[PDB]
Design a binder for this molecule. Structure first.
Ligand SMILES: O=C(Nc1ccc2n[nH]c(-c3ccncc3)c2c1)[C@@H]1CCN(CC(=O)N2CCN(c3ccc(-c4ncccn4)cc3)CC2)C1
Length: 347
């Protein structure tokens, strides 16, 4: 078994000639040569079985991507693991190899408007399909948007994805959250568990702003500083939005703040297209109930050159009910991971 940066990649006969891409808490991602399709692929080695939370995230990643088939969503081409549950210690997930991600691209290049427009179109096209399956991505950010030189974009990383549950979205003020700080909607800090589609639209708004200036729009240094950044640009919420805030503590907090005027989008982004900023405004709407939905965003004048509902497919088989992985022990989750990966075994 070949080694990369001091890690055993036991991918067997089908995959050889490895090369390091990146790393994270999840494990390591590498490029490899596929000996059955004759093309280079991405392979990531995951070792989650010692903790329930790592098993939940691994089962979410696998279960969702196996049920999706869309041009703007990374697939899972193969999964390698041991023939028995007793011997399964690692899981290797094989995916299409891309050239870079939007995080890396924005460090080296300023994007023209027509690149921004096409990338935004693909993000929303993929998100329409996700949301049509009643699924929430919950961690959209530049490093989860994969790109190639032909400018194809694919959304990856569904380890925080959940089935939408608007009836159980409520939570208290300043409730802990797992998804990436800078892309969190204001309601996450005020009254929301991130169980509605609107959570993803806010993240897309953040990504659009980031493509317009090569800098994150709301770079909070810590948890409440994230809401300081959001309110710093959006200004004080309206009386109507305060009347929608649910929590006594959230309402008291917002009423205690000095009045702050809205920073105009054309001052933050003086060289941006006016239609891009009108769409940005609608995605970065404070009240999640008034925030634009994915189908409305695709229909916005900024994306009119690409908008074609007949070429923006939806899911055939939406997730009807919640996955219910929150109260399952790590041993049960290992069994489910084993069962979900069975279709890739020889025999
Ligand atoms: O899918 C992912 N990345 C991909 C995919 C295909 C690509 N093709 N081309 C590229 C590419 C990117 C950049 N530049 C050039 C090319 C790809 C990148 C990322 C990598 C990780 N993945 C999520 C994931 O697989 N999981 C969620 C987290 N989970 C998890 C979390 C933590 C731990 C953990 N274990 C031990 C200690 C601490 N934490 C274990 C499991 C494992 C499953 C999202």
């Amino acid at each position: 078994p070949e080694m990369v940066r001091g890690q055993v990649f036991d991918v067997g006969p089908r995959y050889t000639n490895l090369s390091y891409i990146g790393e994270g808490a999840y494990g390591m991602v590498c490029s490899a040569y596929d000996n059955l399709n004759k093309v280079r692929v991405a392979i990531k080695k995951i070792s989650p079985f010692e903790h329930q939370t790592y098993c939940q995230r691994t089962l979410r990643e696998i279960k969702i991507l196996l049920r999706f088939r869309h041009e703007n969503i990374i697939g899972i081409n193969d999964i390698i693991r041991a023939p028995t549950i007793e011997q399964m210690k690692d899981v290797y997930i094989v995916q299409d190899l891309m050239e870079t991600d939007l995080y890396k691209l924005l460090k080296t290049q300023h994007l023209s408007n027509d690149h921004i427009c096409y990338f935004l179109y693909q993000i929303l096209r993929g998100l329409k399909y996700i949301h049509s399956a009643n699924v929430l991505h919950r961690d959209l950010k530049p490093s989860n948007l994969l790109l190639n030189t032909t400018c194809d974009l694919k959304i990856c990383d569904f380890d925080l994805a959940r089935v939408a549950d608007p009836d159980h979205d409520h939570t208290g003020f300043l409730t802990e959250y797992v998804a990436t700080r800078w892309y969190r909607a204001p309601e996450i800090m005020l009254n929301s568990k991130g169980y509605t589609k609107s959570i993803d639209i806010w993240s897309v708004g953040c990504i659009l702003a980031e493509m317009l200036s090569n800098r994150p729009i709301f770079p909070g240094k810590h948890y409440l500083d994230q809401l300081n950044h959001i309110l710093g640009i959006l200004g004080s919420p309206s009386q109507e939005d305060l009347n929608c805030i649910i929590n006594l503590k959230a309402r008291n907090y917002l009423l205690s703040l000095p009045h702050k005027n809205k920073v105009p989008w054309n001052r933050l982004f003086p060289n941006a297209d006016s239609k891009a900023l009108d769409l940005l405004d609608k995605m970065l709407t404070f009240n999640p109930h008034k925030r634009i939905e994915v189908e409305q965003a695709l229909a916005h004048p900024y994306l009119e050159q690409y908008y074609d509902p007949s070429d923006e497919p939806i899911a055939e088989a939406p997730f009807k009910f919640d996955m219910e992985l929150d109260d399952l022990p790590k041993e049960k989750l290992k069994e489910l991971i084993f069962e979900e990966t069975a279709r890739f075994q020889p025999g």
